[PDB]
């Protein structure tokens, strides 16, 4: 995979729930993240942390933006990030 690991923790109601999609190719990360978008608006997810362990910095910054973006659409008030080199934390808390 390189360095390209799309992990989602869903802090439910008495449950973690964690899948990790990790991948080096083009486009799978982008089919992911639409069916990702819906998956977290069905299920109703109110406290999350998305870790994007990425490759590079510039990477990192469109990553974190994505996120942002992705989080902004489904309506999140606590948008908390943590970069740790290139590996972006964003933990949202409704």
Known sequence: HMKVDITI???RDGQEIEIDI????????ERALQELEKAL???GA???????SAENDEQAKELLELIARLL???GYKDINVRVNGTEVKIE???
């Open 9 to 11: 923790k869903i802090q």
């Open 46 to 52: 109110r406290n999350v942390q998305i870790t994007i």
């Open 92 to 94: 949202v808390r409704v």
């Open 41 to 43: 608006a069905r299920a």
């Open 72 to 74: 902004q659409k489904l």
């Open 22 to 29: 990790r991948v080096s190719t083009g486009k799978e990360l």
